[PDB]
Amino acid sequence: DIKAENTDANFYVCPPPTGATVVQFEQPRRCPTRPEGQNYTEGIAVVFKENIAPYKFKATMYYKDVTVSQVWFGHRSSQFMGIFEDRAPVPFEEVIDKINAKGVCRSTAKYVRNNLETTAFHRDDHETDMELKPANAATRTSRGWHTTDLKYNPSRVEAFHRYGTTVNCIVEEVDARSVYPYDEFVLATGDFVYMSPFYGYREGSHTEHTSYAADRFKQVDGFYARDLTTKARATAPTTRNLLTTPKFTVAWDWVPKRPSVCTMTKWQEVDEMLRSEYGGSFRFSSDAISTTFTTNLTEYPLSRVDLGDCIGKDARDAMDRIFARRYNATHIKVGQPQYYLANGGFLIAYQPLLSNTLAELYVREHLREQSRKVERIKTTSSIEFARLQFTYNHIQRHVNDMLGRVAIAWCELQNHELTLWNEARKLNPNAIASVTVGRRVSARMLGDVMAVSTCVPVAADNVIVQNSMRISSRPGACYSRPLVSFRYEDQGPLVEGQLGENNELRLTRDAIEPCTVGHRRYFTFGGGYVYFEEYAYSHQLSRADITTVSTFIDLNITMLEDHEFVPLEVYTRHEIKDSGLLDYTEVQRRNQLHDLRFADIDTVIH
Amino acid sequence: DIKAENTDANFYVCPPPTGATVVQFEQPRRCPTRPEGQNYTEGIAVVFKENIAPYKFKATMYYKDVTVSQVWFGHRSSQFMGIFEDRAPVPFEEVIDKINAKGVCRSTAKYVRNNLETTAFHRDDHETDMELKPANAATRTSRGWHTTDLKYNPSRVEAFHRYGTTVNCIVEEVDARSVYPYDEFVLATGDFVYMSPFYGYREGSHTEHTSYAADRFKQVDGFYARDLTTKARATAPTTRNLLTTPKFTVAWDWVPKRPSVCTMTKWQEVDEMLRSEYGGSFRFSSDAISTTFTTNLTEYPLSRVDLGDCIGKDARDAMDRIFARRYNATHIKVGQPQYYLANGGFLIAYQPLLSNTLAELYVREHLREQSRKVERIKTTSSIEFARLQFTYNHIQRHVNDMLGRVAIAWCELQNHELTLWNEARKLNPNAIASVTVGRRVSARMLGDVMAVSTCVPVAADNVIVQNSMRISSRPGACYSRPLVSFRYEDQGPLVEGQLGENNELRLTRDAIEPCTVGHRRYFTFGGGYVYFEEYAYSHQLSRADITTVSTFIDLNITMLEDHEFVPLEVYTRHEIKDSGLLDYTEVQRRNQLHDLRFADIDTVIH
Amino acid sequence: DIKAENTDANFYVCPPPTGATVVQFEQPRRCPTRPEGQNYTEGIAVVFKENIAPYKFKATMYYKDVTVSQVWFGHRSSQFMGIFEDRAPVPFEEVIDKINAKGVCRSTAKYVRNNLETTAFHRDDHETDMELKPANAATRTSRGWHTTDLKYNPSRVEAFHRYGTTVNCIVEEVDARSVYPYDEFVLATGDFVYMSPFYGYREGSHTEHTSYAADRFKQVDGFYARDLTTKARATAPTTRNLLTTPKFTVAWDWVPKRPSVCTMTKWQEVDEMLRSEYGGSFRFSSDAISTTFTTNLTEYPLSRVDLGDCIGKDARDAMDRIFARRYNATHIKVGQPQYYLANGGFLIAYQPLLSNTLAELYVREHLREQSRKVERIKTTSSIEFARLQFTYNHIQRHVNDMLGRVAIAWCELQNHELTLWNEARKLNPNAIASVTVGRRVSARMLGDVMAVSTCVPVAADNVIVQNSMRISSRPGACYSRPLVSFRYEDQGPLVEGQLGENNELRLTRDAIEPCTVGHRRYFTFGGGYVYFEEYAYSHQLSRADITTVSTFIDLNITMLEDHEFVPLEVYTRHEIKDSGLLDYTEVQRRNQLHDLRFADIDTVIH
Ligand SMILES: *[C@@H]1O[C@H](CO)[C@@H](O)[C@H](O)[C@H]1NC(C)=O
Ligand SMILES: *[C@@H]1O[C@H](CO)[C@@H](O)[C@H](O)[C@H]1NC(C)=O
Ligand SMILES: *[C@@H]1O[C@H](CO)[C@@H](O)[C@H](O)[C@H]1NC(C)=O
Ligand SMILES: *[C@@H]1O[C@H](CO)[C@@H](O)[C@H](O)[C@H]1NC(C)=O
Ligand SMILES: *[C@@H]1O[C@H](CO)[C@@H](O)[C@H](O)[C@H]1NC(C)=O
Ligand SMILES: *[C@@H]1O[C@H](CO)[C@@H](O)[C@H](O)[C@H]1NC(C)=O
Ligand SMILES: *[C@@H]1O[C@H](CO)[C@@H](O)[C@H](O)[C@H]1NC(C)=O
Ligand SMILES: *[C@@H]1O[C@H](CO)[C@@H](O)[C@H](O)[C@H]1NC(C)=O
Ligand SMILES: *[C@@H]1O[C@H](CO)[C@@H](O)[C@H](O)[C@H]1NC(C)=O
Ligand SMILES: OC[C@@H](O)[C@@H](O)CO
Ligand SMILES: OC[C@@H](O)[C@@H](O)CO
Ligand SMILES: OC[C@@H](O)[C@@H](O)CO
Ligand SMILES: OC[C@@H](O)[C@@H](O)CO
Ligand SMILES: OC[C@@H](O)[C@@H](O)CO
Ligand SMILES: OC[C@@H](O)[C@@H](O)CO
Ligand code: NA
Ligand code: NA
Ligand code: NA
């Protein structure tokens, strides 16, 4: 006579299957396997970069400031009518006999200006040899020497225009700088020089560039310089180039072009540079600098490189030094040092290696080193793409390694679990089966197979319980589970059955049991429970009350949340530009406006 | 009489529950679901950047080196008193009638210097028209032409000051360069020119900038140039600007400002630029370059951009060329090309797309393209923040995708597992229950629920076994499990029970069994085993001996270890700066020290 | 008489074990635990960088363009013989009495040139005081003023050489710029000045650098400037430096060196800068800029820094302003502001913090702030290594956090699973055991242990079934499972047994069963099934037919695929260089070729 308290569930009549429909538990699947593991070859690496450093060398300038001053005299004053200042070369001979020999210098200048030979006499007086005194010391200045420090104008002869000459033999060490092709260089003064620093006579150095005549250059063999301050003769000789331009006479110690120059610079040395082979490329991993390189499989011809001899010396010099401190007692060099080109344009020198362990493998890999086998290379300033490559790769693996491993433990588990479901199905088919089919049913074991038949739904408001459970027709023998009556649909007849497990509606009431004392049980009725006390209904219940426990194992996985990368520079191109103390462009844009701003440019009088 | 060998464990008396405390297995939880999946719209993209390239064009300089030389003669020598060198413009008329027509040039100069008109005659001789010969070929030099190559000084008249003039009409092609606003430009020589290259008369070009008078500029219409070397007349005419500065006469072919100029440069072309919508922004993914862009939802007005017409031509020119080689047979353009602004300042042109597949969706998305709808933009040099954005995002997903998927397989598993625990509990409640409650207990099935009662601990040193298992009161009927006696506490009475499963202390000995031959068994006693042989104790044991097998499935997960990112530049700002051959600042800092170092600056004589 | 249809499997005879070999289920392992969780200390941070900005200040130039022109007159024309132009300083006195007082200027120049005092008179006429008019307005130009705008040449006296003087007192405001050590600076004009801007007399400013005499510098105390355009006297006084170089007289308002200068620049302000302690270093995480810093544990002495006072003011000024808008009501400053040095060279100022929550912890951490306790620092331009560090770390954790958590849920699961396998083994040992041992066997429970004995293989082509299952010797009592006969090897005798579960060959046929109606079953025979209908063979079968269901739970894990990072720059070093309008190097390389190209350099006549 008693209904249900909560109807947020559904009942099901489970008529035994006939065998019509038959299923089977899916057999174990085949589990994936971890890759054979990447093979990393050890090897010392050296990375060269496009040398943007100008070739630098030292030199010395020899010239004479020639200044002629004209003056007009007044009754109680005077004025410069014109100061015509000029700068003349110190003839080759004077540079050797006077300056280099005795630290002296002629009081005259003698050179060619405007297709003509002029001659200046200091103070318009007879010629003399004057000693060279050091120039005034100044903050951050190369060494400088000169003849006199006082100019010379005409002696007073009132109401007249007189002329006065001033000669100052100046010599100072400067810094010259040349760039590829090295067919011309510049001094610290700004004076350009249109000859190769490597020009000369010895050893084919005469095919170097010169835009000058032949009587201007004079290479001196076996040359000992006499310092102009300490006055000491050089202990060793040099081959000395001496060029004489219309404005000055440069000189410098001649050296060969190939050894003194190189279009590449040793940039990064790497102890451990892992080399691997991925789909027709080599990945040079450097854990140290966090950088991975991508190259081709075949080497790169050094001979194809324009002026790149330092590379050889530079590289080997390092691979030896490293092999020493490190590989001297653990590894061995494999094949000769190899050279490959990387994306962006970084030249990489490599020396494959093997530990004393795998000594037995030398033979094979040695061949693999040999199977690897006039312009200039352009390199990028940004090495981020590689560190991205490195960082991404480094992570691409771990994630896939761990997640890959996980995948396998899983497959093995599901297959491993089958064992249990198999046993469980025999025990409680109606329960195990349902889950598996996805729908609520009833099933039986036709040997080694299952045969299922669906269970018909029944609303809860169509279910009644009997206030008792005792049998009178068999006293001392009651039912193990509560008695109930139910309805199909709403207007259909009323049926009676015995309450089963998990709201099954059993058509039979053969689940009998010899009555006993201390009989107390809870039976899942509706969306909750029904507590019968001593073979008699007591009251229903919600599932909330009954203390809940868990067969589930928890796992708290949050997701990785978004993040914005703000554009960030340490120094903007604006700062970088501003940093410069002087700006040529600005200086000219300003200075060249002078006559527009401060003067009249078109006005003419007659 | 026999104790235990190992006492690193604990015993438990498990008195049947009364039903007082009752629990229930937690019901299946609800499993999360993978997001609906991100919607990526295909589209061809073009990315423009702040054009830092100066506007560049070609021109030609017309001037005359005017040099007056004064000389003093001696008995056996001579000297330059003053060489006053000047540089004069070639008047507009002469540039057309003499130079352009016949490759000739006047032997005179005629111009205004210092608010006055001066006239120089070459060699101080009557005027002439002289032909223009090519200048001496030099390494890397623009074309140059001139009149004469020999200077001119006065003929000898001993003991006198004489005057000599030298005129050299020089013409040479130079490279001019202008920057925004393009109201002035510079020549390859360093000479500034304070007029817009776009100045002129035609089509409002007269509102361009000029800091000069009107008689200095002269635009020539229908202009055919006669090459000075090949002597050939141009086949096509140009509008020719001719400005005459106090120092020289520039000239160049006039062109419009808007088409010839643009404040942006087509930088990167992208075939596949995925566009997505995340919380009020568009993420432009380029797999190719590894770069993701962040923009607003509404477009950006090109009209708002200052001088940006090339952008239009540039963009479309590309989206067509790409759509051709690629999208010609697979996709279709959606709406008009759209323009959005990205962080950092990269202008992005986009052309949304759809494959022939989803042709039925054109209508809707077309509107979504239209719903999208005078200064200059500043762009950063660093595109790393984006490649970080890209790289991070690319990984942020996979990890969350896979780990997300995992989470779900888990929830489903635990719920799936419940089925088993349910069956297992009926079988062996005391075992299944314990694990679940967390503590060791005993339990019974009060229908569809569990009722538990704790088990009291018993030290191992308080446990004794009987050397036998045979019953005399029922011969041919022994016990299935060993006999034992135990103690509560240490000083308490001694109790007798039957050994149960996993060290349970059963209060009853009703586990009887008809004796049999070949009876041999191991029973978990203490921290090990007790091997009874033929219903009689034989000896205890440690668990070590018994071959162990595993129900567990292994998973080896290591963690991702730290890594340091060393600061790494390919070229330091120091190198970058050094690379430059000449440094204006250095040159001036040095040169301007001259008089301090090598001369006397305050000394005065009278 | 009937064989098998499919033989892609194997049969096994499973003779009961004797107890010889005995095993045991591995006991639960100990599960790892998540780390105690990283402790992050909140704190406001400010990051300074190597200041590459030149020190900038304003000044004013005072000079006089002195121009002497000489002309020769002809019958119908004239010419400049020589224009000797010079530039003279405006004496200290004139700068105060004439220019600053009345906006006037002397019509004469009076200075020292070439160790001699010259005197120029404008127009060669008596001295005058001339007013200073503004210079012609020009695009983007500092203020300029001058005396006259018309030059002056000699009046016509035909057939003669006459002389004319021109003096133009010019004054213009320029921008000076100095760099460390700030012992010299330059003007906007390009004129260098070899004195420290901080030189003076007051407060030890006389130990600053000067390469000049003492009569050239003149610091004026209590100085009010009278604007030359508005003519207004300054409302406040300044200490005014006035240096007089041979070419011009600079002047500027003197200021102290330490406050006006600093070798570092406040670069990035960070509200939330997480500070953590990892193996002897601090990691400064800024979520905002995506950047993590690495420093030492002990602070860095500011006193050790050369000229770094602005840092103090700059830093605190910010930490206060932030603490205001934010920490004013939630946190509290902990200890004094601390300073540490980071890799690459970024100075970081930090102010540790605690929320009002953990107020009780102030005491301890305060000490930890104190336990933390003349050159210049070099900073890198690339901040990518840090954003890599940040990005990598940020991900290194999540992956390890989640995957770590996973590992634990696993261990707990396997141990949790043991419970089930334990129950399952009792039920079906032959099944549960096999899986566990890895090989197919049969086993029995010797109490609390297992005893196994292998099962011998039997080819399928050696297996026959009986067309029926009914017993005649016991009518109304048949077998539950099909009858079969089999062979060991190929030539061995024929044995008879009863079909068991999963192709076991039972030696006994005691699995009898009282015959029943509606008997229909499938028995796994060979690689498929055998369907007996009513105790009689009907036909074999393949496993394909029988509807398959799954006990396995799916998990779809793909791997993270490779990706190439193309080298990518926004502006190449080539563009960066090109961008510059003028290039000094180019200008000189070109200009200095002049005489080679356009003239004769060696030819001499006599
Ligand atoms: C790497 O080397 C191992 C043995 O050293 C070898 O078994 C394996 O084949 C190699 N890796 C690959 C991908 O072939
Ligand atoms: C490697 O060789 C291929 C084929 O010549 C070429 O396309 C590719 O650019 C090369 N890679 C590098 C790093 O230059
Ligand atoms: C995670 O789930 C919740 C917190 O979100 C909590 O109830 C549970 O105990 C947590 N599990 C573990 C072990 O982290
Ligand atoms: C993406 O498109 C699909 C169908 O094309 C749609 O079902 C889904 O709603 C869209 N994504 C989101 C997040 O709405
Ligand atoms: C997008 O619009 C918002 C609102 O005007 C603005 O704050 C933000 O700066 C814009 N984003 C970009 C990329 O400029
Ligand atoms: C991982 O665990 C250990 C090695 O740490 C080893 O005993 C076991 O076999 C490994 N499992 C697998 C399958 O990697
Ligand atoms: C971090 O702080 C917590 C309490 O605030 C403490 O228990 C823990 O020991 C600290 N972390 C470490 C690694 O010691
Ligand atoms: C920190 O101190 C150690 C020991 O003096 C030193 O080697 C290291 O370079 C320092 N770190 C930094 C950031 O300079
Ligand atoms: C994943 O496995 C396959 C697709 O590869 C499919 O049959 C299955 O349904 C998928 N499982 C889930 C839930 O993603
Ligand atoms: O470029 C010439 C080369 O020698 C230098 O850069 C390095 O030594
Ligand atoms: O033309 C030179 C002018 O611009 C100033 O530099 C003079 O000091
Ligand atoms: O800046 C002017 C523009 O035309 C060039 O940069 C590219 O063509
Ligand atoms: O003032 C010019 C001096 O610095 C040298 O460049 C001369 O060669
Ligand atoms: O370098 C001097 C300093 O004061 C400036 O860079 C910032 O104010
Ligand atoms: O020597 C100056 C020449 O190179 C040109 O700049 C003249 O206009
Ligand atoms: Na003489
Ligand atoms: Na004449
Ligand atoms: Na006079």
Q: Which residues line ligand 1 (CB under 6 A)?
A: A 36, 39
* Of the candidates B511, B471, B503, B468, the residue with the CA atom closest to the CA atom of residue B486: B503
| Chains A & C: contacts with CB separation below 8 Å | 317
Q: Residue C298 has which token pair? A: 């002990």
Give C166 Cα–ligand 15 centroid separation in angstroms.
26
- Report d(CA C110, CA C108) in Å as an integer: 7
User: C548-606 adopts what CATH topology?
Assistant: 6.10.250
d(CA C312, CA C301): 12
Taking only residues 530 to 589 of chain C, the set having a beta carbon closer than 8 angstroms to any beta carbon of chain A reads 543, 546-553, 555, 557, 559-560, 562-569, 571-573, 576, 580-585, 587-589
Q: How far apart are the first and last CA of chain A?
A: 137
Q: Across A199-344, where does the E strand assignment appear?
A: 220-223, 238-244, 249-253, 264-270, 274-277, 282-286, 291-295, 331-333, 338-342
**Distance between CA atoms of C545 and B384, rounded to whole angstroms?**
59
Is C322 in contact with C44 (CB distance < 8 Å)? yes
Integer angstrom CA distances of residue B205 from A490, B195, B243, B245, C280? 94, 12, 15, 20, 68
> Given the DSSP bridges, would you call strands C22-25 and B547-549 parallel, antiparallel or unpaired?
parallel
Which residues surround ligand 10 with Cβ inside 6 Å? A 51, 53, 55, 260-262
C-alpha distances out from residue A209 to A200, A217, A248, A258, Å = 10, 12, 19, 15
Burial annotation C527-561 (CB, 10 A radius, 16+ → b, else e): bbbbbbeebebeebbeeeebeebebbbebebebbe
Chains within contact range of chain C (3+ C-beta pairs < 8 Å) = A, B
Residues 6+ apart with CB under 8 A from C26: B548, B549, B550, B551, B552, C418
Residue with tokens 């983007």: C140
Which three-class secondary structure state does DSSP give residue B327? helix
Q: Kind of pairing, strands B504-506 and B10-13? A: parallel
Report strand pairing: A129-131 vs A104-106.
Answer: antiparallel
Considering chain B, tell me which residue range(s) the CATH 2.30.30.1230 domain(s) occupy.
Answer: 1-16+456-547
Of A346, A316, A347, nearest in space to A333 by CA: A316
Q: Taking the alpha carbons of B431, B434, B435, B437 in that order, is the dihedral positive or negative?
A: positive
* Token duo for residue A343: 């994306």
User: How far does the centroid of ligand 10 lie from the alpha carbon of residue B369, in Å?
Assistant: 57
**Strand, coil or helix: C487:** strand
Task: Tell me C592's DSSP state.
Answer: T
Q: Supply the CATH classification number for the domain C17-39+380-455.
A: 1.20.5.1890
Token couple for C467:
């067309």
Q: In whole angstroms, how far apart are CA B139 and each of A184, B374, C40?
A: 10, 45, 65
DSSP assignment of B18-68 equals: -SSSEEEEPPPPPP----S----BEEEEEEEEE--SPEEEEEEEEEEEEEE
Instruction: Give me the helices (H) in B301-445, please.
Output: 310-322, 362-370, 384-427, 429-437
Cβ contact C107:C127 at 8 Å = yes
Q: Which residue has the tokens 């009549």?
A: A13
Distance CA B123, CA B129 (A): 14
Report CA-CA distances (Å) from B351 to A245, B264, B285, B311, B532: 63, 19, 14, 14, 85
What residues 443-472 of chain A have any CB closer than 8 A to a CB of chain C?
446-449
Of A380, A579, A588, nearest to C567 by CB-CB distance is: A380
Does C356 sit in the ligand 9 pocket, CB within 6 Å?
no
Q: Distance (Å, rounded) from C-alpha B452 to C-alpha C195?
A: 96
The class level of CATH for B40-53+260-379 reads mainly beta
Partner B, chain C 135-154, Cβ-Cβ below 8 Å: 138-139, 150-151, 153
Q: Where in chain A is the domain with CATH 2.30.29.100?
A: 40-53+260-379
Report d(CA C264, CA C311) in Å as an integer. 7
Long-range pairs of A102-107 with CB within 8 A, sequence gap ≥ 24: A102/A129, A103/A131, A103/A132, A103/A226, A103/A228, A103/A231, A104/A129, A104/A130, A104/A131, A104/A132, A105/A129, A105/A130, A105/A131, A105/A132, A105/A147, A105/A169, A105/A171, A106/A130, A106/A169, A107/A147, A107/A167
Whole-Å CA distances, C170 to C136, C144, C153, C244, C249: 12, 8, 19, 15, 11
CB within 8 Å of chain C, chain B residues 200-229: 209, 211
Closest ligand relative to C247 C-alpha: 11
In chain C, which residues have their Cβ closer than 8 Å to the Cβ of A407? 555, 557
Which residues, at least 6 apart from B599, have a Cβ–Cβ distance to it below 8 Å? A149, A150, A151, A168
Helix (DSSP H) and strand (DSSP E) numbers for chain C = 10, 37
Alpha carbon of residue C133 to chain centroid: 55
End-to-end CA distance of chain B: 137
Place of tokens 């039903």: B19
List the beta strands (DSSP E) in A501-600.
504-506, 512-513, 520-525, 528-533, 537-542, 547-549
Q: How far is ligand 1, taken at its centre, from the CA of residue A417, in Å?
A: 34
Which amino acid is it at B558? T
Which chain B residue lies closest to C556 (C-alpha atoms)? B405
d(CA C593, CA C223): 50
Query: How many interchain CB pairs under 8 A, A with B?
Result: 317
Strand extents, DSSP E, A195-321: 220-223, 238-244, 249-253, 264-270, 274-277, 282-286, 291-295
Q: Which helix (H) or strand (E) covers residue A578, if one does?
A: helix A573-579
Is the separation of the CB atoms in C176 and C56 below 8 Å? yes
Which of C177, C590, C592 is the best substitution to test chain B (most B C-beta atoms within 10 A)? C590
Cβ-contact A488, A38 below 8 angstroms:
no
Q: Is A172 exposed, middle or buried (0-12, 13-18, 19+ CB in 10 A)?
A: buried
Contact between C508 and C493 under an 8 Å Cβ cutoff? The reply is no
Q: CA dist C579 to B33, B53, B178, B308, C571, Å?
A: 54, 5, 10, 18, 10
- Cα→Cα distances C474→B493, C469, C471, C478, C520, Å: 59, 12, 5, 7, 20
Strand partners, C238: C223
| Residue C236, C-beta contacts closer than 8 angstroms, at least 6 positions apart | C224
DSSP states along B73-127? E-SS-EEEEEEEEEEEE--HHHIIIIIHHHSEEESEEEEE-SSSEEEEEGGG---
Q: Which residue has the tokens 């060099």?
A: A333
Closest CA relative to residue B459, chosen from B428, B486, B496, B436: B486
Residue B384 has its nearest CB partner, among C387, C414, C419, at: C387
Atom number of ligand 12 nearest to Cα B260: 4
Strand C478-479 with B528-533, pairing? unpaired
First to last CA, chain C: 137
Pairwise CA distance, residues A96 & A104, whole Å: 10
- Residue A37 CA to chain centroid, in angstroms? 25
Which residue, among B71, A69, A73, A162, has the nearest Cα to C86 in the 3D structure?
Answer: A69
Q: Which two tokens stand for residue B194?
A: 């304070």
Closest Cα to atom 13, ligand 9: which residue? Answer: C554
- DSSP sequence for C535-573: SBEEEEEETTTSEEE--S-----PPPPP-------SS-H
State phi, psi for C106 to the nearest 5 degrees: -70, 145
Cβ distance of B563 and C392 shorter than 8 Å: yes
Q: Is the peptide bond before B32 cis (omega within 30 degrees of 0)?
A: no
Mutation test residue for ligand 7: of C34, C38, C39, the one with most atoms within 8 Å of CB: C39
What is the rounded CA–CA span in Å between residue A236 and residue A355? Answer: 48
CATH 6.10.250.3280 domain range(s) in chain B: 548-606
Are the C-beta atoms of B288 and B270 separated by less than 8 Å?
yes
3-state DSSP call for residue B561?
coil
Say how far apart CA A183 and CA A195 lie, in whole Å.
6
A407 and A32 in contact (C-beta within 8 Å)? yes
| DSSP string of B376-397, one letter each residue | -----S--HHHHHHHHHHHHHH
- Between CA C377 and CA C382, with CA C380 as vertex, the angle to 5 degrees is 160
Would the CB atoms of A563 and C86 count as touching at under 8 Å? no
Compute the distance between CA of residue A535 and CA of residue A523 in angstroms, rounded to an integer. 12
The third-level CATH classification (topology) of the domain covering C1-16+456-547 is SH3 type barrels. (2.30.30)
Atom number in ligand 12 closest to CA B180? 1
Q: Which of B68, B69, B118, B129 is nearest to B89 (CA)?
A: B118
SS3 label, residue C505: strand
The contacts of residue C351 (CB under 8 Å, 6+ apart) are: C43, C44, C45, C319, C323, C333, C334, C337, C338
Residue intervals of chain C classified under CATH 1.20.5.1890 are 17-39+380-455
Is C158 an 8 Å CB contact of chain A? Answer: no
Q: Which helix (H) or strand (E) holds C169?
A: strand C161-178
Type of residue numbered B113 = R
Q: For a pocket test of ligand 5, which of B284, B295, B296, B378 has the largest count of ligand atoms closer than 8 A to its C-beta? A: B296
Nearest CB among A68, A379, A405 relative to B82 is that of A68
Ligand 1 centre distance from Cα of residue A275 (Å): 14
Residues 495-534 of A with CB under 8 A from B: 501-502, 520-524, 529
**Which amino acid would we find at residue C346?**
F
Q: How many angstroms away from the CA of A472 is the closest CA of chain B? A: 22
Q: Which residue has the tokens 């006429």?
A: C125
CB of C431 within 8 Å of a chain B CB? The answer is no
- Of all atoms in ligand 6, which is nearest to the CA of residue A405? 14
Q: Which atom of ligand 6 is nearest to the CA of A408?
A: 13
Q: Which of C324, C355, C318 is nearest to C337 (CA)?
A: C318
Beta-carbon separation of A402 and C402 below 8 A:
no
Token digits for C465? 């079934």
Q: What is the DSSP string of A477-527?
A: -EESS-EEEEESTTTS-EEEEEE-TTSEEES----EE---TT-EEEEEETT
Residue type, B3: K
Tokens (6 digits) for B259: 């088409």
Would you give the DSSP letter of residue B527?
T
Ligand 14 mutation target, pool C48, C49, C50, C56, most atoms within 8 A of CB: C56
